[PDB]
Amino acid sequence: MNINPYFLFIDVPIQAAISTTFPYTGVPPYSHGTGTGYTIDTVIRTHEYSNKGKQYISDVTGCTMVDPTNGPLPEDNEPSAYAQLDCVLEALDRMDEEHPGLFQAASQNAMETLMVTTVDKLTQGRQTFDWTVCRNQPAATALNTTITSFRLNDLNGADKGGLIPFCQDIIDSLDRPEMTFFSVKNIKKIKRIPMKVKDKITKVEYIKRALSLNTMTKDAERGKLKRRAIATAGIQIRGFVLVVENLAKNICENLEQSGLPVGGNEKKAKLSNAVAKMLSNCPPGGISMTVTGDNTKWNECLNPRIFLAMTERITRDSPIWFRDFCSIAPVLFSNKIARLGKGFMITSKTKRLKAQIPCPDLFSIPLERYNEETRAKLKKLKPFFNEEGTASLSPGMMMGMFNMLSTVLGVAALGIKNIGNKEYLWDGLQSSDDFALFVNAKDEETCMEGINDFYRTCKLLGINMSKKKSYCNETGMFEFTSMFYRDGFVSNFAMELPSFGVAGVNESADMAIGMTIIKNNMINNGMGPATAQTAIQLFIADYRYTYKCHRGDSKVEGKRMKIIKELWENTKGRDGLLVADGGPNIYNLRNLHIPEIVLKYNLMDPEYKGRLLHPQNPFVGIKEADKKMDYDAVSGTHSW
């Protein structure tokens, strides 16, 4: 008798048991060593899909640029970045016709928001590339450092309030013959101390710094055998990017196909609505087929030049000042520069020695001293390599930069709905690089033609769909946004329930934030009662261990435990004790929305409540816990 776990699928649908098929209880595969190699494949891969375009030398930076747009049409089934401008405009024109006034409404709404926007908004985000230090620093730190350096070069506008003057000077800063800024200098005093120093760089150096994108390896990524590269941009492009993403978001919000702006429990509704609508529209006696789609090299075949065209088309009726503002981010992305990792490692086994060759000195060593894969990588990288350790990456995109705009382009291809007036009608859903397509036709053979026509049509817009990762079957069972639908039942089982542990802020808060997540999971992710009950148990065990607050009847020894045990005997009413004070846990499903302080107020003894709730106690981000999520908590001695 040999146990075969896969046999559970004989008596259960795979969708129902799909949760067990996902290894989300294990370590997310992290990146070990240099991510420099991975960044190089991205550059080689990105240019390999656009080498048939036009190659020229950029006069602003001297880099070797490649432009696959309007290039030769693809001849094979490999990924192709040769998007035809006329085809893209045709899709957008069809898109606008189906939603009259949408482009104008989004442009006007985006502008109104831009006028009111202030510089403090740029402080919201993730790690950004700081040109002053050539490193990665928080958005607030980078914004301040950029602001201070602009003051040195007399570039003002940041203090003027609105984002327009601040973004105006950024463009102005690109013309200054030399740029002065504060740099961190590590002088050896033995000790090493970093100080400020007034550093100056030339105009071309600043141009490259402004266009550069720091590259790391995508860590914690789940569901892939091989790592990749995740890039972050500097402050020079942030502000312009926020507006364009706002512009794309406004358009996408009004699209039925779009599923990227939609978030939460509405995804299940979107899946059900689309399949229901397509089945109803199915011709009598026809066949409705659904394609579980997936795009590979989705970011490496999208062109900033096309996004520049889309921004022009979306803002057709708008002031030139706004049209110029919305067209800057694509301009700074067509001339982007990819900073390559942190070099390579070369070792001698006989001498037991190792050394790190930095990126500027990649080709200073003979290529025969690199392994085969790196040797080939560097041979192909030479044309686009810069002497400062960076590689020119004009074609392609970087994941996560233009997500809303990419969805708009994908939805546009879905709106064609037919080719050659053939006897099929296709539609679907789109969210960033993930899509699902439904085709209705009189028979399967005509349905396949519709899918093949869609495949060819996508190739014309720069959208490549993976044949290896894509499959088709009759409508009613498909997958989208990593969600499984089957016969009217949606089985979202890919989100990993966040570690039900203390949020690490304080005792009363963590209990409030913790109990909020379980409640949200019940409401949103359809988390069941029992599993919700157990999620409470696991968190409490974690909560007591971290905070050293076990039940007063427990035999745990500790510094605070002795005081907790003393309080347990002293207090007459044990049920009123807080969990953090060694009190019993009284949380349940019905009461996942009341702070424990308020819960135990009635049961709390007069002495304990007065001590804990002393108006002037010596121990005393309350709204949102660092993504911003609100939690309900009560001020008290535990709020240190």
Binding site: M522, H593, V598, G610, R611
Partner: protein, 135 residues
């Protein structure tokens, strides 16, 4: 660090991870209590907090409820409420924009007042249903 919990796990075991204010109320905590170094001459130990709730002056609490009426209103709405039977049959939930507390798009099958939404987690279910009446 990039993980608040782990940073907190390491912080909790530290001798004096809590930052204490300066005042007379901060001087009534003993320096050491049966060996445990509550404070130093300011930095504070979590044991000092545990002592506060155990031994200390009983501060008055008269305006606490008035400051926190909303939460206490939630508590009494739960306490005075009544519970009915449970239905295990399939349920049909209509997506609607509802108010969580006395707004988000949620699937609700029945009363849509904020009283029911606040407890919606314990009422609706994929293959079960419960009858609730807020107090």
């Amino acid at each position: 660090e990039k993980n608040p919990s782990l940073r907190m796990k390491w912080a909790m075991c530290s001798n004096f991870p809590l930052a204490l204010t300066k005042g007379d109320m901060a001087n009534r905590i003993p320096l050491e209590y049966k060996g445990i170094q509550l404070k130093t001459n300011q930095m504070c130990s979590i044991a000092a907090v545990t002592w506060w709730n155990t031994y200390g002056p009983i501060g008055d609490t008269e305006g606490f409820e008035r400051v926190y009426e909303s939460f206490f209103l939630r508590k009494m709405r739960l306490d005075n409420a009544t519970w009915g039977r449970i239905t295990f049959g399939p349920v049909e939930r209509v997506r609607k924009r509802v108010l969580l507390n006395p707004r988000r798009f949620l699937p609700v099958a029945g009363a849509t007042s904020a009283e029911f939404i606040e407890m919606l987690h314990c009422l609706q279910g994929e293959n079960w249903r419960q009858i609730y009446h807020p107090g």
